Write an enzyme that holds these catalytic residues in place. Structure first.
Site, short mmCIF file in Angstrom:
data_model
loop_
_atom_site.label_atom_id
_atom_site.label_comp_id
_atom_site.label_asym_id
_atom_site.label_seq_id
_atom_site.Cartn_x
_atom_site.Cartn_y
_atom_site.Cartn_z
N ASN B 10 0.79 -1.21 0.00
CA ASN B 10 0.00 0.00 0.00
C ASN B 10 0.84 1.28 0.00
OD1 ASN B 10 -1.36 2.25 1.81
ND2 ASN B 10 -2.94 1.13 0.72
N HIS B 82 -4.10 -3.47 10.04
CA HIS B 82 -5.26 -3.60 9.17
C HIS B 82 -6.18 -2.38 9.31
CE1 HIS B 82 -8.87 -5.12 7.28
NE2 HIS B 82 -9.52 -5.11 8.44
N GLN B 95 -14.05 -0.08 5.01
CA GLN B 95 -14.95 1.10 4.94
C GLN B 95 -16.09 0.95 3.89
OE1 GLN B 95 -11.85 1.20 3.61
NE2 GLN B 95 -12.11 2.00 1.51
N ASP B 113 -2.13 -14.48 13.09
CA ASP B 113 -2.36 -15.93 13.22
C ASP B 113 -2.70 -16.48 11.83
OD1 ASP B 113 -5.12 -15.34 12.75
OD2 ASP B 113 -5.68 -15.75 14.84
N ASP B 117 -6.74 -11.03 9.22
CA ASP B 117 -7.23 -9.95 10.10
C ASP B 117 -7.93 -10.53 11.34
OD1 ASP B 117 -6.10 -8.15 8.18
OD2 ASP B 117 -8.02 -8.11 7.05
N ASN B 210 -15.77 2.23 -9.84
CA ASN B 210 -16.19 1.02 -9.16
C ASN B 210 -17.61 0.62 -9.54
OD1 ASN B 210 -13.69 0.88 -7.81
ND2 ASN B 210 -14.44 2.15 -6.13
#
Lengths: 232, 235
Positions: B10, B82, B95, B113, B117, B210
């Site tokens: 990112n 995250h 979001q 783990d 997330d 989108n």
């Protein structure tokens, strides 16, 4: 040899009127007392009937929304240019209502009678509404069509050499209040996504803050949509 | 003395990493073999487990979408950052999904783990979603909040001096396909105007294309919404 009064408060129609005037010559171009066009002379029609009748052969209005005095209509030939396709969605902001209800929109040149956007049609022309259009994008095309139609028919309007024809039905009339009530979006209202997209794009006109809702905390929020067809 | 590997694909998390590196020193910043960050060196984490484990004391990822190799988690302390509020709308674009479902969104720093997330939370902070927010405007605030939270807890993360707590519930997980499915607006779909506005604003993010519908002639049309709260009276 034809003396013409043009009356309009609309900025686009005024630009058209100025061009007609440069070409015709014996024409005056006025706005009303509530018009907001800077530097355009003002004419209070109700108070100027005998003067207009004595001076002009033809009154040509654009986008007029207030009925003319009966004495004016009788005393001189009165023609209006309306950006809707009569008799459908006569009155306020025809494209907004057509986007929503599917009826035709366009430009209509008609003789003026005692009802709004009513009376013998001299000429009219349809404007297609695409799935991706908003009120603003249709309005822009309507202003081109208006110029195209008026320029084509100008000589016949000036001469009175047309044969005008009343529409076959009364159609429907929208007033300012009908627009105002559309502006408010009810977040609880149920419908299809298409119906909702129509409502938002009908209320989108450049950056005007038309569509609004009140949010879950009491705050007013304005909305518009941006619609973009994939290039072919 | 704590040698750190940061991984992120990112662009905002990467600028944060570079600032952390300037303050920390003993820290390398990598992207994945599929990252599109120009000039950022690349690390194929699955192929590099033994190397990472021997060279670093902590692996700190940001917005990580691929599950970590089990041997890596076991071999070295791994922490993820995250940009959702665990356990709600874990996974892709929290979001977007929270604008639609009303669940909390925010940023969560957690131990890694074997699920996405998921894992004991070191710290988290909520981000409010306003009725006028789009995915884009919430996301920008999440990036500010991420920097705020990570800077606040960095020393503790570095030292391992926190006590992480698992969330009390599993919550829910969104994957890329769940996002892709949202993109197509069916014109016949029924709902409230509110629900539809939430859908369009959730799918509005800067100028990304989108949301789309297909009209009756088969033409594809992209859709974005602009929302603007009435400005308060002058303060």
């Amino acid at each position: 040899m034809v003396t013409i009064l043009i009356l309009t408060d609309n900025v686009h129609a005024h630009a058209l009127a100025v061009d007609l005037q440069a070409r015709h010559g014996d024409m005056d171009v006025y706005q009303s007392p509530i018009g907001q066009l800077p530097g355009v002379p003002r004419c209070d029609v109700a108070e100027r009937v005998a003067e207009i009748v004595e001076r002009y052969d033809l009154v040509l209005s654009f986008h007029c929304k207030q009925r003319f005095p009966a004495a004016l209509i009788d005393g001189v030939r009165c023609v209006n240019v309306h950006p809707g396709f009569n008799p459908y969605n006569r009155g306020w902001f025809p494209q907004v209502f057509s986007i929503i209800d599917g009826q035709k929109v366009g430009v209509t040149i008609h003789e003026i009678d005692d009802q709004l956007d009513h009376g013998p049609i001299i000429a009219q022309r349809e404007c297609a509404i695409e799935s991706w259009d908003s009120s603003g994008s249709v309005y822009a095309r309507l202003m081109d069509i208006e110029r195209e139609l008026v320029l084509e028919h100008f000589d016949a309007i000036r001469d009175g050499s047309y044969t005008a024809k009343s529409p076959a039905t009364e159609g429907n009339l929208n007033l300012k209040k009908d627009f105002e009530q559309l502006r408010r979006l009810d977040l609880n209202e149920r419908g299809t996504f298409g119906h909702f997209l129509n409502r938002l794009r009908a209320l989108t006109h450049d950056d005007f803050r038309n569509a609004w809702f009140v949010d879950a905390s009491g705050r007013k929020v304005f909305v518009r949509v941006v619609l973009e067809p994939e290039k072919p």
